[PDB]
Structures are given as C-alpha cells and as structure tokens.
Amino acid sequence: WRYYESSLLPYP
Amino acid sequence: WRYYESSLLPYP
Amino acid sequence: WRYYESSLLPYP
Amino acid sequence: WRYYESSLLPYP
Amino acid sequence: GIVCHTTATSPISAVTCPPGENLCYRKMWCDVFCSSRGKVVELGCAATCPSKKPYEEVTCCSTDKCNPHPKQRPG
Amino acid sequence: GIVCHTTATSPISAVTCPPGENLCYRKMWCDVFCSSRGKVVELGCAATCPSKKPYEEVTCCSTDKCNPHPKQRPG
Amino acid sequence: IVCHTTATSPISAVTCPPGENLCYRKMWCDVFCSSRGKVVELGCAATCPSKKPYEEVTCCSTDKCNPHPKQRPG
Amino acid sequence: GIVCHTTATSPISAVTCPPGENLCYRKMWCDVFCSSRGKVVELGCAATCPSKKPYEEVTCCSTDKCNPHPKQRPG
C-alpha cells in the first residue's frame, strides 16, 4: 500500500 | 503455547 | 549443552 | 585489528 | 552463561542464555481466564530486567533456573 | 527471527518476517504529492539492507518493531 | 510445526516460527564418537540444512518427527 | 541473536553478537595503502546499518557469518 509520512491511512 | 500458574501443561 | 545418541542427558 | 582486502592477516 | 526456564518449549525446559543475557525473568498478568486459571506465565532470558508495567507482575534474578513456573521447584 | 512493521498490510501492522529476512527497513522518497503529503513510506522485512538512491532515505535495524511509520515511535 | 529442540535441557518441543515447516535432525561424530555415538542436534528449519561432509541430516514435516534417537517420534 | 565475523579478533573469527546487535556489517574504504593492499576491511555486529559516506563501502546482512572478509566465502 502507498503510505505517506503525513497520516497512518493509506492512499491508493 | 500459553501457560498459567495453575498447571505446567500448555493450553493453545 | 551437547547431546549424543547414547543418552538423553547433555554434556557440558 | 586493521585489515585489508589483500590478506586475512592484519597489518597494524 | 546463565541457565533459565523458558515457556517457549513444551513441557517447560531450561535453556542456556546467549552472551550478555545474564538474568532470568518471570512475567505474569491476568487474561480472561485469570479467575479460573490464574495469571498467564512467561519465562525466559533477558539482558536488562523487564520494566514493571502497572498491570504486569515481574520477577528478575541472576542465578541459574531461578525463574521456575510457580508449580515447580527452582533450581 | 524478528517482527517488523510492514506497509504491505492495511493498517500498518507488525508481522513476523519470512525465514532468512531478519532485519527491518524503512524507505522514504518524494513523489508528486511530496509537497502536500510528505514522503512515501515503505516498510518491510529484508535479508540485506536495500541499496539507497542518493534521494532515497533508507533505515535498517534489527530489533523488533524498530521500523515504525514516522507517526509512531520504535519499540 | 512443532519440533524437538536440543537447545533446551531436558530436550523439549518448540513451535517453529512462520515459514519454518520442517523438523531436522543433524548428527556427526566428535572425538567421543566411539564411546558416546554421534552428536545430536534437533530443531526447526525452512529449508533442509545442507549436509557437511561428516554430517548426517534428516528433515521431516510432521509434529515431533525428529526425536532424539533414544525416544519415540510423534 | 546472530553470529558474525569481527575484525576485533586476530585472525578474523565469527563471534556471537551482544544483546541488541542482531545484524552484521562489512565496511570498506581506501586508506593511504589502498594502492598496494586494497581497501581497509572492518567487520562486526551492529543494531543499525552504518551510515555510508559516498566513498565508503557498507553492505548489511542478517544471516549467520554473512559478512566475510573479501578473501572468504559467506556461510
């Protein structure tokens, strides 16, 4: 899954 | 395996 | 420890 | 010990 | 090295602890069956004594097989 | 043996690494949304430390749950 | 899989971590082989351990299939 | 837990790593004698992979004896 440093929710 | 003080036998 | 086929008891 | 790629013996 | 009881095996047996791990530990806490079976029991090796959390009960010691299951004789 | 955070799951969780992969790694790099969301975060297990591009950020460690998402502290 | 292990004293059974679905027995002679027999090592493995020239290795995939030679499997 | 080559001993040998250091590293870099002897070689245990400078060589792995001296085979 794509994650980002800004949140624990994945973005795909 | 998981032990309890009541017995030397393991459970799961 | 170290076991051998001759016994179920360990060595060093 | 200081080693080098050329040998397994140290040089220091 | 230190010898310590471990719950990783069945039945409980004693293991030689790796270098630098010179304490045994017992860690006990209630799960759902605490009323009928008592506290869960965990035994093993450690380098540093586990930090006592408010809901856990911990014993740390530095002699061989000093962390027996409550139902057996230490040593 | 070792447990490591992984981004392969949703939500991020701690998983036991397959045999032969006994270190954790975190890898971060900027994509198109880096300005708004920050860097991509990729977490998983590995046998060898991933080779780092000059613009990538790679962390390798060998203690349980040492590779958290930036929004979580190790341990 | 559950497997015998020589890491403990007495020998006990351990549950192997995920991905390690074999038991292994590894035997080889040391200096005392004439009087005590071969060294015995029992444990878990993902791939069957590769046998060194002097070693004997057996791998199996049923619970406690790797007993010490002086005990029953299973 | 992990066994690894260390340049702290003579000759190079495989040692059991202290508690909390569960990965091996090999580090290579040119010193004054790089033309005649090649790169300096340093091997040991570690918790985290050393931060590699552009001219340094660092490779990290987490299986026993995975960090041999260049004149030896892993495993």
Author numbering:
A (entry chain C), B (entry chain H), C (entry chain F), D (entry chain D): 1 to 12
E (entry chain G), F (entry chain A), H (entry chain B): 0 to 74
G (entry chain E): 1 to 74
Quote the study's own text.
Three-finger proteins (TFPs) are a class of proteins (peptides) including TFNs and their mammalian homologue that show similar three-finger structure as TFNs. The α-neurotoxin binds to and block the muscle type nicotinic acetylcholine receptor (α12β1γ(ε)δ nAChR) on the neuromuscular junction, leading to paralysis of the prey.
To test the binding specificities of the rTFPs, HAP peptide, a known peptide derived from the nicotinic acetylcholine receptor, was mixed with various rTFPs and separated on a 15% native PAGE gel at pH 5.0. HAP peptide was only able to shift rec-αBtx and only slightly shift rec-Hannalgesin, but not rec-MTα, rec-mPate B, rec-κBtx, rec-Mambalgin-1 and rec-hSlurp1. We compared the elution volume of rec-αBtx, rec-κBtx, rec-mPate B in gel filtration column (Superdex 75 10 300 GL, GE Healthcare), and found that rec-αBtx, which were known as a monomer, eluted much later than rec-κBtx, suggesting rec-κBtx was not a monomer, which is in accordance with earlier reports that κBtx exists in dimeric form and also with the solved crystal structures, while rec-mPate B elute at similar volume as rec-κBtx, suggesting rec-mPate B was also a dimmer. Six rTFPs’ structures were solved with x-ray crystal diffraction data using molecular replacement with known homologous structures. Through extensive biochemical assays and structural analysis, we showed that our rTFPs were almost identical to their native counterparts. Though it was generally considered very difficult to obtain rTFPs using either E. coli or other expression systems, with our pipeline, we could repeatedly obtain over one hundred mg of rec-MTα, rec-Hannalgesin, rec-αCTX and rec-mPate B, tens of milligrams of rec-mambalgin-1, Slurp1 and milligrams of rec-kBtx and rec-αBtx through one round of experiment (usually finished within 4 ~ 5 weeks).
